[PDB]
Structure formats: structure tokens, C-alpha cells
Write an enzyme that holds these catalytic residues in place. Sequence first.
Site, mmCIF file in Angstrom:
data_model
loop_
_atom_site.group_PDB
_atom_site.id
_atom_site.type_symbol
_atom_site.label_atom_id
_atom_site.label_comp_id
_atom_site.label_asym_id
_atom_site.label_seq_id
_atom_site.Cartn_x
_atom_site.Cartn_y
_atom_site.Cartn_z
ATOM 1 N N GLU A 190 11.601 3.566 -2.069
ATOM 2 C CA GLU A 190 11.758 2.837 -3.333
ATOM 3 C C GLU A 190 10.455 2.772 -4.124
ATOM 4 O O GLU A 190 9.979 1.692 -4.475
ATOM 5 C CB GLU A 190 12.268 1.412 -3.082
ATOM 6 N N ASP A 191 9.821 3.937 -4.285
ATOM 7 C CA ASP A 191 8.687 4.168 -5.181
ATOM 8 C C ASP A 191 7.398 3.531 -4.704
ATOM 9 O O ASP A 191 6.535 3.252 -5.514
ATOM 10 C CB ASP A 191 8.960 3.737 -6.624
ATOM 11 N N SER A 192 7.233 3.262 -3.424
ATOM 12 C CA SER A 192 5.894 3.010 -2.939
ATOM 13 C C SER A 192 5.298 4.288 -2.371
ATOM 14 O O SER A 192 5.885 5.360 -2.451
ATOM 15 C CB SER A 192 5.893 1.898 -1.899
ATOM 16 N N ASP A 196 12.669 -3.365 -6.916
ATOM 17 C CA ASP A 196 12.020 -2.211 -6.335
ATOM 18 C C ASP A 196 10.531 -2.511 -6.298
ATOM 19 O O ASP A 196 10.111 -3.641 -6.555
ATOM 20 C CB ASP A 196 12.422 -0.932 -7.084
ATOM 21 N N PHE A 197 9.722 -1.523 -5.971
ATOM 22 C CA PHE A 197 8.334 -1.777 -5.641
ATOM 23 C C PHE A 197 7.436 -1.023 -6.595
ATOM 24 O O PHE A 197 6.399 -0.487 -6.214
ATOM 25 C CB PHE A 197 8.011 -1.393 -4.206
#
Lengths: 45, 49, 263, 113, 137, 47, 66
Positions: free
Chosen positions: E1-3, B46-47
Site C-alpha cells: 500500500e505504497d510504502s 493508505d500509507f
Amino acid sequence: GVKYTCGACAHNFSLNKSDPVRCKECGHRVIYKARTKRMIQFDAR
Amino acid sequence: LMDDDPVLFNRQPSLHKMSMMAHRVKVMPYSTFRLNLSVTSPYNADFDG
Amino acid sequence: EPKVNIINAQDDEVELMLSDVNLSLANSLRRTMLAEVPTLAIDLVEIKMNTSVLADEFISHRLGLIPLVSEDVEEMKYSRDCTCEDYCDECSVVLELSARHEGEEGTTDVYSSSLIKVSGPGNLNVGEPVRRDDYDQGILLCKLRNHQELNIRCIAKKGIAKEHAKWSPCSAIAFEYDPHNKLKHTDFWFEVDAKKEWPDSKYATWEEPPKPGEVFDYKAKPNRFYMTVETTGSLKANQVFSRGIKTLQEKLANVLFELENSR
Amino acid sequence: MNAPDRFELFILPDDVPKLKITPDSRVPNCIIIKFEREDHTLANLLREELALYPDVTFVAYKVEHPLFANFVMRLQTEEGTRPKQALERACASIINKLKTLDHKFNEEWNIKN
Amino acid sequence: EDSMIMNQSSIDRGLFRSLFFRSYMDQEKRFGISIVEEFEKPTRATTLRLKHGTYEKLDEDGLIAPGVRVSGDDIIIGKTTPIPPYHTKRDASTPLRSTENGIVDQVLLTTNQEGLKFVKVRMRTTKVPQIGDKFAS
Amino acid sequence: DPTLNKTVKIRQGGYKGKIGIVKEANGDRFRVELHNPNKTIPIPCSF
Amino acid sequence: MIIPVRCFSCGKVVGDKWDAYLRLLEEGKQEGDALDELKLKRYCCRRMVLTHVDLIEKFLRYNPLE
RNA sequence: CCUGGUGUCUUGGGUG
Ligand SMILES: [Zn+2]
Ligand SMILES: [Zn+2]
Ligand SMILES: [Zn+2]
């Protein structure tokens, strides 16, 4: 030769490296180089 | 390195074989690696850092 | 066929209704005013002395954000398009600032009003830092205490907001249409009753509510766009709306030119 | 370190045309127009205008990647009209509407002055 | 995805911008009765195994001055050590870290408890948020 | 070459008016380490 | 550190209103009302003045290094 | 007038 600055009394003077590292005025043993002669530019961004 | 050169891409820990797959390079500005989002799952990537 | 009805007006903001145009044109006007209307702004700071407690580029960064009078900027060239060697009078304004605190007590506050225009493309009214009144000291830049000095030389240049936000002439642009949602472009979230839980637009009384029987007009289009253009004082509000339209024209004109030359 | 120059959004390189027209020979009378150093600002304006013309059968655009200031438009017209000519017509219409619009604002502005 | 997408104009006006400071320390070492290292701008003719970077930002005292921008591998403190048994010294200078840049902000010069010369060079740069930087509520 | 490491001002182009230092002068195309952003650029000698 | 020149979110100039805000607090006005008088209506602009912390007053106390 | 070397061993604190 090279401009310095006294960390206590702010007197300015020069030293040709072989002199001891102290202020002539108060004897303070922490000194700082003065800023360059050259002009500095910033882009204000 | 230039467009469509194949390179091997990899995230640790390499728990199974799809931790290492070959991708085609696309050169881009800015300093991160870019992945199409559908490959995050096999890498368990993930990022968040 | 486009019609305009100005609801309110003053020096630095115009509130207006725009009608008989397409949604896309109202939006492109919104974007153009924010992003492509040229202004003047500091873009090079030569620090000859800075013994304040603020870091050199910190002070320089604040300088870039100071709004300058940009009224005559259309006759001025971009630096990148000028035929001259280094800068000159046709592509830049030079400003200077010098402050110092004498005395062992108190604090000298350095304000934007101490920015002195030194040269510039005379006699065009460009380059003065904007002021509200005459006794208004303006924007705080730094603060000085005993023996601390700030002596800087600033180069102001013409630019657009695409490159850096300091060149934007607007601040916010309020923008809305269809206050009663007759077009059904939004589907309201509610817990119990959608009408009681959502506040009214501030233009609810400028259009009439949908009748309780009324069928859905599937042919109706958006047609009245209320917007308010606030500015920072770098340009007057009427100039921004006018030059937004003007700038958008040349861009379309440039496209039209290229088609009739590519054959 | 890898940030591109922000001025590259609107300044055209010398070897790069502002505008490029190519055919789509897979269907009759269809062109692909590539616009360099432009945005949604220009693109959406042209697109809606074109769609209300009776002889335009297809118009669309996409900004392929926001990190590159370009977009590509696809325009197909019926057999009678030539697409490139139709684009010129759409341009002149909008220049006229904005000229009118600028005039009517000036008049209304002096009354409130 | 959490950016997350950040407003570029907010960054331009100063949001989440920060200063970054790094200090380098060096001092002269003693190897004998009168065998000491020496701060100087080393001449290419008299000193062997010089670094590949530029020496042209040093002043005559062997120290760089505040206000000068520096990039990676530039020498900021020149120091030599003599070779035991002219053309007798070896470079022992300190280069800026290869991945960094900025402006020299302040240079401290003093002596240590043993009486030899002692310097510190603080470098400042500004880090502007960009793609890849990390944030959290 | 006699102009390496000497301070330079740029008189044409998008970087016109900026200070720099000649980092590398192989031929015709110079490498100026610009002061203003942390970047070293390739630039022609006419500029 | 010192009052920002612009509101981060919308861009309205707020760096000329800091002095006016401190004076209004001496006269006993409440924070919400003081911001109202200065015509800072959108809450993006309000956060800038209401939540700034003025550290430069502390840094100046350290007796100048020249 | 080409070649061109800057340490190790730990410990501690961190990232996923
Ligand atoms: Zn002293
Ligand atoms: Zn000029
Ligand atoms: Zn705000």
C-alpha cells in the site's frame, strides 16, 4: 566582555551593550557574535 | 499507556461507523502508528502520508 | 571436507570458489564479513575551530567515513568494556587535523593525508588513514579559501557494522552459484526463448552445461559457491576472510557455553 | 526521537539472559529456545545443520519482528535423544567444519602470495 | 500500500540526508519617551512571570552564542518590559519551539529603521531519514 | 543541588567520553541532555 | 555539495577519485571510458561520480565572513 | 515551600 565581528572588515572587538551598534573600523551596522568558548562534540554519524 | 490497553482509533473523514474501531495497544520504537494491513480498507487508509 | 580454490587474488579483493558446504554456511559467511568483522573508525570529533563554508556536522560526518588501518584491532578492547576512567591508550586512537590557507588567491584542498596520529596503543599498526601509494593525497574532506581555517580533534574507536555502516570492512560481496540453473531454483522470464534472452554468468565456463537428454536430479544440492570479497583497505582481503570465520566461531562457541552452564 | 540505540542489537542487558529454554509440554520431548540479541546469521546456520541429523524430527525458527533483534527456535527430537544435547552436537560440528575451512584457506593463500 | 523499504546502510553513508535551518527574529519596542524594552539576561529577583525553561545559555549581552546546542523551551533571546505604576519588569523572552533541537549557527545584531536594537538567531539541525518520512519519484 | 546546568563528561558505559549538560537532578538518576544525538538520557551518578 | 566519501549503495570508496576524473576529461576521454580507467565497474559506483554536481566551487566565491 | 500566564482576527499557501 563579548566578542563580536564586523560584517565588512572582520575586525574583532567587544561591546558592553550600551555602546551603539556599529563597527569601530568602518562604521558598518551589521555585526555578528563570535562563537562560544565551549568545546563542541559531534558523533560523526 | 501499556500493552493490551484498548484505545479508539480514527481516520477523518468519518464516513461510516467502521471509521472508529477499538484496537489493542502494542508499544513499539519509531514514531509512526502501525496497523495490520487488513484494516486499511474500512478506514480507506493508505500509507502515502 | 570443505574445499577452497582461489581463482584470483590481490591486496584488496579475493575471488574464490567455496565448495562442499551447505548454502546456509556460505550465506552466513557473507553476512558475517559485512556486518560483524570489527574495524576501527572515527566516532567523536571535537571541533575547536571551523570557519569553512561546510557545516560542522557535515565535516564530522565525512570524517566518520574515512577508512583506517585496522590490522591489530583484535587485541584492542571495546570502549564499553574498559575498566578505565574516560578514554585512554587502550581503548581509543586520537587523531588531529589542522589546515589553513594563507594568501588572497587560490584554494587549499584539505585531504585525508593531513590526518596526523597523535597517540594510540603502541606499537600496534592501527589508526593511520589508508593510502594507495605514497604520493596519493587520498580522500577530499573540505576546501578552504583565504583566512578560512579548520582545526579538529578526532577520537577513533573500535566498532562493528551492526551499529553504523562506517565500521564495515567490505564493500560489495559478489556471490553466485549454479550458473546453468541445473537445480531449477529460478524459473526464467522470457518473451520468446529463455536461453537466448538471458546473459551468461561470468562463471559459465567453469561448469558444464546440462545435456539435452539429461533427467532432473531431484537429489542434487547446491555445492559450489563462487564469491569475491572486496575491501576498502581498512583490512586486507585475506584478513577479512580469516576473521569472518574466526568471529563466527566465537558466536557459536558462546551459544555452546550457555547451554552447559544453564543446567 | 523514538529511534532505539543501534548498539542494543548485540549488547545484552544485565537482567536478560542470552538464551532461554522452556518446554512445550503439549507434545513429548519438545523445547522452545529463545535467543536474545541474535539474527538470521546465527539462526539459519544452526537450522540447516540440525535438519540433516537423523534424530531431529522437527526444527524451525522465526524472527518475529525485525525491529527487535531476537528469534525463537523450536526443536523436537525422538524419544531416545534429548533436544538440548542434540543442539550441542550441532554446534560442535559447525565449529569443527569452520576450523577445517579456515585451515584450508590459509594453506591455499600462501601458494598464491 | 505504497510504502517502501529503505536500505539502512545507505542512510548511514548519507543518502537523502538534509540540513534544516530556522531563524528567529526579535526587536525592542518603544512604549514612551524613555520607556523601551531591553535585551539582558533577566535576574529572577527583579523580573516577574519568568518562563519555566533554563536561562543558563544566555551570555551577558542577552544573546546566546553560536555553537551551543539548544533544546525545546530553552530561552535564546532574553528581553524584558517594565511594568507601569522596585521589582518592575516583565519577561518578554523568546523560547525555542518545543518540538525542535539543534545548534545555534549564527547571530545577527543590528538596528532597525527606528533605531532600536534588532537581533536574528539562526538555528541549524540535521534531519536523517527515518520511518515515516516521505519520498517520491 | 550544586551541579545542575554545569557541563559534564561521562566516564563509564556506552556513552563514555560524551559532553552533556545536567537538565534535571532529582536524585541518584540524572538527566543529561547529551550533545551528540538529540536525546536526553537517564543516567546514574557514579557515571 | 562535495563528492561523497562512499558509494551509497555498495560502500566502495569513491571520494579519492574525483580529482583524477576531472583531469581525464581535459585529456578528451569520454565519461564512460574515464570511469572504466578508474576501475569503477558496478553501475552503483558509476552513478556517484558521473552524476555528482560540485556546488562547493560556487559557495567558496562568497568572500569569507571573518 | 507548595501554585505557576503568553493573544487574537483574518488572509494566503499547502497535506489526505
Ligand atoms: Zn569594520
Ligand atoms: Zn581504554
Ligand atoms: Zn557503487
